[PDB]
Amino acid sequence: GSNSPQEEVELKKLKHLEKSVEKIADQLEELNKELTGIQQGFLPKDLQAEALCKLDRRVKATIEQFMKILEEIDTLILPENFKDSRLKRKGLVKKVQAFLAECDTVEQNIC
Amino acid sequence: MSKGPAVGIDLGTTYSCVGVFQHGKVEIIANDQGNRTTPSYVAFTDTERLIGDAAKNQVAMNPTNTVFDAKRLIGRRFDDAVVQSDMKHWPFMVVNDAGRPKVQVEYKGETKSFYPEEVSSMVLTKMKEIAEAYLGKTVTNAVVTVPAYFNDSQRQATKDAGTIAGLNVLRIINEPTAAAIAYGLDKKVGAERNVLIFDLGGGTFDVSILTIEDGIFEVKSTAGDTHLGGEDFDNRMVNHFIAEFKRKHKKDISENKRAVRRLRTACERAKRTLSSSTQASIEIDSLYEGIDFYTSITRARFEELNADLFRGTLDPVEKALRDAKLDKSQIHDIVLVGGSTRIPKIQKLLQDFFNGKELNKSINPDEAVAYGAAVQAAILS
Ligand SMILES: Nc1ncnc2ccccc12
C-alpha cells in the first residue's frame, strides 16, 4: 500500500464536510415535511400558498449552505496519488449537486 | 465594564477595520468571527437586522434588503451624478427624500427607509462593539477616517454617523494622512516632505499627494478611479477560464450562475496565491454538465490579462503629480495601502515609475489606515 499520513489530513477535512452536508440535508428533509404538511394540512387553499411562500427564506438558506460547502471543497488540491480523497471529493460534490436539484424543485413549487 | 482607551476606525466602502494603540504598538482587532476587517454591510430580514459578516453571509439569499456601499452615498444629494450612476448597479432601492438619498428596504414585513449616515452608524456601532469585546472595557472615543476628496457635507455626514452610534469623534482625518501617520512619516527629521499615497483597495483607486512640514499635513492633490479594484482583476481571470472551458470542452458555463460563482470564488483565491507564488492551481469537480475543471494560472498570465488595468494605475499618479506642481523626483515617500497593492506587478510598475525607489509596504495594506487612525487616537487621548 501507498496510503500516506498526509492523505489522512485531507480525508479528515472531507469527513467534516460530509457531516456538514448531512446536517443541511436534515434541514432540507424538514422543509420537505413542512411543505407536505401545509399541502395536505388544515389550511384553506388560499392560506396554503402564503404559508408555502413563507418557506422561501429557509429553502434559499439551504441552497446557500450547500453552495458554501461546494466553495470549501473547491479549495482542496489533491494529488493524483490521493485516490481515496479524490473519490470521496467526487462523491460528495455529486451528493450536494443532487440535493441542490431537490432544493430547486421545492423553490419552483413555492411562491 | 471600566473605561477604555481611544480607537482608530477605518470606515471603508466595502470593509471596515478597528485598531487600538496599547503597550507601545497598534493592535488590529479581530471581530467575533475572527476577521481583522468587517464588511460594511447591513441586512434587514423578516425578523432581524444583521451587520458585518452575518449581513454579507446572507446577501445571496436577500439581495434587495442587504445594504452596502453607503459610503458612496454619504453626504451626497440625490441628483449627484455619482448617486445616479451607482444606483443602476445596486440590488437595493435608493429613493429621493427632499433632495437627499435614502436606501429603501423591507424590514420585518414593512417598507423602511434609512439615510446613508444611519446605515454607516450601524457599521460604526459594530466596530465600537468589536473593540469593546476585545478590550473588555467601554469604548467611546474614536478617530474616524474619510477620503481626502470628501467635501463639507460628506465629512459632516460621517461625523453624524459617529455621533449616532454613540461615539465621541476625536478627529476626522484623511485616509492618506492616516496611512502617512502609520509609517511615522510625520516624525522624520529634515525639511518639508512630499508624500505619495497609492491606495488600491475596497473597490476604489485613490492617489493622494501630501506635504508634511513640522508635523503639519497638507493635501496638494487627489486623483484615481472610483470603480477600480480587485473585482476587476477577478473578472478578467473568470473570463479567461470561461474561454478556456469553451476551448477544451466546447461548452458555455456563463449562463449557469452557480458554475460561474464556483469559478469566481476559486479565481479570487488563485489571485491571492499569485501575490506570493508564481503559479496557482484550481480543482473544481463537476463544475458544469458533470465536467471536472482542473487547471492552473501563472503569475505572468494573470499579469497579461490585467495588463491595461495595471498600467492604467500610473495615469492618476501622473495627474496627481501635475496637479501638485511636482516632478516624480520630488517625492520623498511612497506609501502602498489597499489589498490590491500586494500584487507584485503593481509594485514593480510603481517602483519603476519612481526610478527604483523603495516603497513603504511593511504594514498590512488592508489595515494601514486603521493603524494610523489608532496612533492618532492615542496621541489625542
Ligand atoms: N486583495 C488581494 N489582492 C492580491 N493579493 C492579495 C494577497 C493577499 C491578500 C489579499 C490580496
Residue numbers in the entry:
A (entry chain D): 149 to 259
B (entry chain C): 1 to 381
Article passage:
The 70 kDa heat shock proteins (HSP70s) are an abundant family of ATP-dependent molecular chaperones, involved in many cellular processes including protein folding, prevention of protein aggregation, modulation of protein complexes, and protein transport between cellular compartments. HSP70s bind to extended hydrophobic sequences in newly synthesised and partially folded proteins, in a manner dependent on a cycle of ATP hydrolysis and ADP/ATP exchange. HSP70s consist of a conserved N-terminal nucleotide binding domain (NBD) with ATPase activity, a substrate binding domain (SBD), and a poorly conserved C-terminal domain which terminates with an EEVD tetratricopeptide repeat interaction motif123.
Crystal structures of HSC70-NBD/BAG1 bound to the unsubstituted quinazoline scaffold 10, the 7-methyl 4-aminoquinazoline 13 and the 6-methoxy 4-aminoquinazoline 16 all showed a similar binding mode to 8, confirming the quinazoline scaffold as a stable and attractive start point for fragment elaboration. An overlay of 10 and ATP-bound HSC70-NBD/BAG1 structures showed that the adenine N-9 atom in ATP providing the linkage to the ribose ring, overlaps with the exocyclic 4-amino group in the fragment hit, suggesting a vector to grow the fragment into the ribose sub-pocket of the ATP-binding site. Modification of the 4-amino group with a single methyl group was tolerated and yielded 20, strengthening this hypothesis. Compared to parent fragment 10, elaboration with the carbocyclic ribose mimic 23 resulted in a 7-fold increase in affinity. By contrast, and to our surprise, in all HSC70-NBD/BAG1 structures bound to carbocycle-containing ligands and small fragments, phosphate-binding loop 2 adopts the distorted conformation also present in the nucleotide-free HSC70-NBD/BAG1.
